Design a protein around this ligand. Structure first.
Ligand SMILES: Cc1ccc(OCC(=O)N2CCOCC2)c(C)c1
Length: 291
């Protein structure tokens, strides 16, 4: 899977909100482009003159994420964040010249991402009460990953003393994205656990935070909620479920070639952090079959 790289694997089966610090600083922003940000403005003008209903939105930028020494007391993760936008993303990560920007960032700053917007995404491994994970089918008509399989997710929106409010928005946003797209009541969802961070090398290294969320509804009940919205209540064109038993070998299935990179990141981290038991009971051969 060259199109996904793990930046962070969380310890302890995943981190709760109270164990994470954020540092939001203009030091963590994208660097101005070599020949100026006029190149971003030109791409945006061309786009608006074709699709004048499009508009810009602020986003969090991922600079880096440092884990504490394992087994320590106190905060376990520091997220270094800056600010970016949908406009800056279209002019950098989704530019035809994105690989040239990565090479120039290595040369100029010793940082392949220095000239990239790198907006932070969120996604969820969402488990049902009857032990399935939730998958969504993408429209064949959209620009990104058309017709591919995804997991629920979206965007934390900017709109430890500003730090704790930013961590709150990250955790809140993955629940809101589940409620908006799957049409589930908020009170059927657990507080999220952060599993890790994955990068999409097909989008020039754009990173997503991947979370575990448990729902108190069965797969049949989740399906009913999703469908009862009607086609206008969701961006996806379908919902489906895979037993958690079978997610263990998903990379060996024909489904793996249909998964978009950020969804592959969610499933790899689910397998490593929530699966992959370490104890004698769950590690015994009848509960963890060899191969
Ligand atoms: C991969 C990726 C996909 C969408 C996206 O942001 C979308 C957005 O902010 N929009 C503004 C309002 O109009 C709709 C689009 C970003 C930052 C990354």
């Amino acid at each position: 899977d060259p199109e996904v790289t793990l930046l962070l694997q969380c310890p302890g089966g995943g981190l709760p909100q109270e164990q994470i610090q954020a540092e939001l600083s203009p030091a963590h922003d994208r660097r101005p482009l070599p020949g100026g940000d006029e190149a971003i403005t030109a791409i945006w003008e061309t786009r608006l003159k074709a699709q004048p209903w499009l508009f810009d939105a602020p986003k969090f930028r991922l600079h880096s994420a440092t884990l504490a020494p394992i087994g320590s007391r106190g905060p376990q993760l520091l997220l270094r964040l800056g600010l970016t936008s949908y406009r800056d993303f279209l002019g950098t990560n989704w530019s035809s010249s994105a690989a040239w920007l990565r090479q120039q960032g290595a040369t100029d700053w010793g940082d392949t991402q220095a000239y990239l917007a790198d907006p932070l995404g969120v996604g969820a491994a969402l488990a049902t009460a009857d032990d399935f994970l939730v998958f969504l089918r993408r429209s064949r008509q959209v620009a990104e990953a058309p017709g591919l399989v995804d997991v629920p997710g979206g965007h934390p929106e900017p709109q430890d003393l500003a730090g704790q409010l930013v961590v709150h928005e990250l955790f809140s946003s993955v629940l809101q994205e589940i409620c908006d797209e799957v049409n589930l009541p908020l009170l059927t969802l657990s507080q999220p656990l952060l599993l890790g961070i994955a990068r999409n090398e097909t989008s020039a290294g754009r990173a997503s935070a991947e979370f575990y969320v448990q729902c108190s509804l069965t797969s049949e009940q989740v399906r009913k909620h999703y469908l009862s919205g009607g086609p206008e209540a969701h961006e996806s064109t379908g919902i489906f479920f895979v037993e958690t038993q079978n997610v263990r070998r998903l990379p060996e299935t024909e489904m793996w070639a249909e998964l978009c990179p950020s969804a592959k990141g969610a499933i790899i981290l689910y397998n490593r952090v929530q699966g992959s038991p370490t104890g004698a009971a769950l590690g015994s051969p009848a509960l963890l079959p060899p191969l």
